[PDB]
């Protein structure tokens, strides 16, 4: 587990991989876009130090599964996806490490799973849109943007140092 807050490269790398995974301009996609409603009250609220670790583990799992789909693997570049899968699994192991050890992670009530359920539902909405859009590149770009906006705010719990109040 990562007890001392020295630095972090996991989120940084994953964030970069998603950036290089771009195909077209996002502003050129003003149609296949819609607020998916990224749950923040179950991410940044209450959950902070280690509390969001179980959520992140299952969240990345959803990301992994979604991107490992034959549909996603045919939308992005396999070369980038290869490292993406690697980084995702790397971070997955990093997160579950705290769950393996006797750290105060799974100490919270059913709320530790409730946040996860919210993620599964969030991704379900995404997949639903993808199905309707027939997994078009424009839709994927926005979907990727959502995952990019959500994932960044996922590890942001420790990366946040703007307001102490």
């Amino acid at each position: 587990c990562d007890l001392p807050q020295t630095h972090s490269l996991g989120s940084r790398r994953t964030l970069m991989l998603l950036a290089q995974m771009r195909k077209i301009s996002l502003f050129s996609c003003l149609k296949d876009r819609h607020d998916f409603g990224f749950p923040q009250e179950e991410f940044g609220n209450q959950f902070q130090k280690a509390e969001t670790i179980p959520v992140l583990h299952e969240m990345i799992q959803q990301i992994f599964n979604l991107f490992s789909t034959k549909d996603s693997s045919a939308a992005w570049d396999e070369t980038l996806l290869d490292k993406f899968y690697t980084e995702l699994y790397q971070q997955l192991n990093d997160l579950e490490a705290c769950v393996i050890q006797g750290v105060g992670v799974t100490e919270t009530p059913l709320m530790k799973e409730d946040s996860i359920l919210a993620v599964r539902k969030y991704f379900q909405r995404i997949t639903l849109y993808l199905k309707e859009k027939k997994y078009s590149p424009c839709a994927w770009e926005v979907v990727r943007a959502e995952i990019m906006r959500s994932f960044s705010l996922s590890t942001n719990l420790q990366e946040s140092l703007r307001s102490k109040e």
Partner: protein, 196 residues
């Protein structure tokens, strides 16, 4: 053209738009922005609307420092829109930090690097980055990235040693995030310390 360029002047993001004048010459422009989450909330920066300025600066307008703000420019030719190009920039990929002044003092055996960063409290600003001090002694290119935490709040003092007299070094100030992509190689300052 629609060439957009952004520069960070003392933690402040200033963006400028380069437009060529073939025939029509638009003297006024309007800059709008939004988040990457959903391009449905189009917002326009005050003062940077219907103005004769070719650049727009902001301070707290960009709250999503951990996101990619999409850029859109509306080119108006007097009283009619001519063109509108779409672009996007990632702060964690660019973050061009050049304006900050940097000094270096070469002694008989050690180098005193002193970067002048904006005096600000790190506990009041979310800034995830790794400042790297570039070194080039006698042509030898080297890079050093020390503890930025609590050191980028003002004069960044870094001591470079393990060298020999007559070493001409060129120091550059750049930063990395996920990888060595944001190579903002600022004007290399070449200084020669006492020879031998």
């Amino acid at each position: 053209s629609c060439t957009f360029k952004i520069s960070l002047r003392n933690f402040r993001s200033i963006l400028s738009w380069e437009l060529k004048n073939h025939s029509i010459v638009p003297t006024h422009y309007t800059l709008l922005y939004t988040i990457m989450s959903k391009p449905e909330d189009l917002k326009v920066v005050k003062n940077c609307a219907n103005t004769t300025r070719s650049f727009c600066d902001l301070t707290d307008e960009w709250r999503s420092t951990h996101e990619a703000y999409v850029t859109v420019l509306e080119g108006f030719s007097g009283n009619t829109t001519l063109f509108s190009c779409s672009h996007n920039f990632w702060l964690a990929i660019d973050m061009s930090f050049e304006p900050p002044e940097f000094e270096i003092v070469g002694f008989t055996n050690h180098i005193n690097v002193m970067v002048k960063f904006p005096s600000i409290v790190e506990e009041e600003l979310q800034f995830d980055l790794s400042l790297v001090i570039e070194e080039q002694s006698e042509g030898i290119v080297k890079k050093h990235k020390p503890e930025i935490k609590g050191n980028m709040s003002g004069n960044f003092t870094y001591i470079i040693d393990k060298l020999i007299p007559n070493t001409n070094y060129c120091v550059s100030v750049y930063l990395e995030h996920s990888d060595e992509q944001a190579v903002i190689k600022s004007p290399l300052k070449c200084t020669l310390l006492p020879p031998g």
